[PDB]
């Protein structure tokens, strides 16, 4: 069924991501995001692979997609703030790390990555 089809391309892309074949993970998750487009976990894994291949401009977009579908995923906000930090959008990343602290109070990244902003 449709849920199991959207699991298959996730489970497939995860195995390429574990093998460090990040681009093949992007390809698999794209087939799922294109089949379904309503699961926040599909683009959440796609953004991680884009971030490993240093395409932070593309990783930002898939992190925003996970936040449009779910809106509560602390990992997707931490991944968007991290992408923006290497993208030069440091003031926009400050707001995303402050948002991770709403989703998990005292979050270890949401203190530390928000603290990296001030290394001026």
């Amino acid at each position: 069924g449709p849920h199991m089809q959207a699991i298959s391309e996730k489970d497939r892309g995860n195995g390429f991501f574990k093998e460090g074949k990040y681009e093949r993970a992007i390809e698999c998750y794209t087939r799922g995001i294109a089949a379904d487009g309503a699961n926040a976990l599909l683009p959440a894994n796609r953004a991680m692979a884009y971030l490993k291949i240093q395409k932070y401009e593309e990783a930002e977009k898939d992190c925003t997609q996970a936040i449009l579908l779910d809106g509560s995923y602390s990992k997707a906000f931490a991944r968007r703030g991290t992408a923006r930090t290497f993208l030069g959008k440091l003031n926009e990343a400050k707001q995303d790390f402050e948002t991770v602290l709403l989703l998990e109070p005292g979050n270890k990244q949401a203190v530390t990555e928000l603290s990296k902003i001030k290394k001026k």
């Binding site: 892309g13 995860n14 990992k75 931490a78 991290t82 979050n107 270890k108």
Partner: peptide, 9 residues
């Protein structure tokens, strides 16, 4: 505890 960034499913 809280969520780590660098991971997939």
């Amino acid at each position: 505890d809280t969520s780590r960034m660098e991971e997939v499913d």
